[PDB]
């Protein structure tokens, strides 16, 4: 009779991704540490998105706010845009939804 809370079930994906990217054997005592760092990072991300949306003048969060945040983080630049990172790190099912593409008589989706 196993019991798993949704929080740990959600964090296990990123914990396993960390274990795969480490390419080294890791002690079990680091899992809770990585989970706490992920929680703190999510808190700071939510706060930064909130203040950026407040400064933008709207209540909703738009992709330009996340682009500005990633640019301040040093990940996205003018030359290396967000589309490059999406193509590098995301599968096709998400690229079809994020990056606009034209087909069948200049039909563009999504509308950009």
């Amino acid at each position: 009779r196993p019991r798993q809370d949704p929080h740990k079930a959600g964090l296990s994906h990123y914990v396993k991704l960390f274990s795969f990217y480490a390419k080294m054997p890791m002690e079990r005592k680091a899992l809770e540490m990585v989970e706490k760092c992920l929680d703190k990072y999510f808190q700071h991300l939510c706060d930064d998105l909130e203040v950026f949306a407040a400064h933008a003048g709207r209540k909703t969060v738009k992709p330009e706010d996340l682009e500005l945040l990633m640019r301040r983080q040093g990940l996205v630049t003018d030359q290396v845009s967000l589309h490059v990172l999406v193509e590098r790190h995301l599968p096709l099912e998400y690229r079809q939804l994020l990056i606009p593409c034209a087909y069948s008589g200049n039909s563009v989706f999504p509308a950009q």
């Binding site: 795969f20 599968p91 096709l92 099912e93």
Partner: protein, 343 residues
């Protein structure tokens, strides 16, 4: 192209594992599979496809898979009760492994040869040879293995090498078999009884192969000439004495000091069962020599050939007389003597 989706990857991989042929393997698809493996990691449905692509094109991909484990999931489909329904409706290592030729053929080539530009015959692949009619249709053109030892346990290749009489193939087989017999022996050049039944099974396979082709190999004759003075007469008596029967026809005066002297020295001091065994072996040898000599007259002359078998018969008669004098007139040996004289 549908391999990009992570949800349809295993099923499409399983389908391609069945739909893959030789004309479909191409370098850009190899690069696609490589980048997919780099992005996803070690997936069995990808490892199987990579192994198949390597088998179809060894000069582009190098893969060594560890172990057979279950690569594709054997999940019974929803139509298993329908699969059985349509079935009931339709009711009414010492030896090398079999592999294709080495990829060093046509390794350094500047342009395409004039043969394939005109679409000529070419050759026949080795993996397609699986039945007897396929051997019948392509008997004149065949692909030889990379290691000739693998021919030892394949009937379709034995049927081909039965009538070839080629020098490089014979040399390769001779070298391989001689080295194997020298390294795997139990009382020659090494004291290694750990082999045991392995050497017996190898000798049984060799004897079963040389019963076919109606002749023997030269490696076995060399091994017999080398390891006979060191034999004790009990290790592999059956297989050894069966290998003795397949000796090519030669003059008795030349083959006597190499084989028959040691045979007699081991014969005059052993038990009666060894005597019966060597009598049976000599009878089989005489039968084989007579069978091979009977066909030459239909094609040293015969005068010098009959002298050899006459000397052999006189030698075995002297052996039989001395053995009857030694064993105090045992009928169990007289039976074998009369069996030999019957032939």
């Amino acid at each position: 192209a549908s391999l990009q989706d992570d949800a349809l990857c295993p099923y499409v991989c399983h389908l391609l594992y069945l739909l893959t042929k030789k004309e479909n393997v191409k370098p850009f698809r190899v690069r696609k599979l490589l980048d997919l493996q780099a992005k996803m990691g070690m997936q069995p449905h990808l490892q199987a496809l990579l192994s198949l692509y390597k088998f179809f094109a060894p000069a582009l991909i190098s893969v060594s898979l560890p172990v057979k484990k279950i690569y594709f999931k054997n999940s019974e489909n929803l139509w298993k009760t329908a699969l059985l329904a349509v079935k009931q409706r339709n009711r009414g290592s010492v030896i090398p492994v079999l592999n294709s030729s080495s990829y060093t053929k046509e390794c350094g080539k500047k342009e395409m040869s004039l043969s394939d530009c005109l679409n000529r015959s070419g050759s026949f692949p080795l993996e397609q040879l699986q039945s007897f009619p396929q051997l019948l249709q392509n008997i004149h053109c065949l692909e030889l293995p990379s290691q000739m030892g693998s021919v030892l346990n394949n009937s379709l290749l034995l049927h081909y090498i039965n009538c070839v009489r080629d020098e490089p193939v014979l040399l390769r087989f001779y070298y391989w078999l001689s080295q194997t017999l020298q390294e795997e022996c139990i009382w020659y050049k090494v004291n290694n009884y750990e082999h045991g039944k392995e050497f017996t099974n190898f000798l049984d396979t060799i004897i079963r192969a040389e019963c076919f082709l109606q002749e023997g190999f030269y490696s076995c004759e060399a091994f017999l000439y080398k390891s006979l003075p060191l034999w004790d007469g009990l290790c592999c008596r059956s297989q050894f004495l069966q290998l003795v029967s397949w000796i090519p026809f030669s003059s008795f005066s030349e083959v006597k000091p190499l084989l028959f002297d040691h045979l007699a020295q081991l014969f005059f001091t052993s038990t009666i069962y060894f005597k019966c065994s060597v009598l049976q072996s000599l009878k089989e040898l005489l039968q084989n020599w007579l069978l091979w000599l009977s066909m030459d007259i239909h094609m040293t002359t015969l005068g010098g050939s009959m002298n050899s078998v006459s000397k052999l018969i006189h030698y075995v008669g002297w052996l039989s007389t001395t053995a009857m004098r030694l064993e105090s007139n045992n009928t169990f040996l007289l039976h074998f003597i009369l069996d030999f004289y019957e032939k």
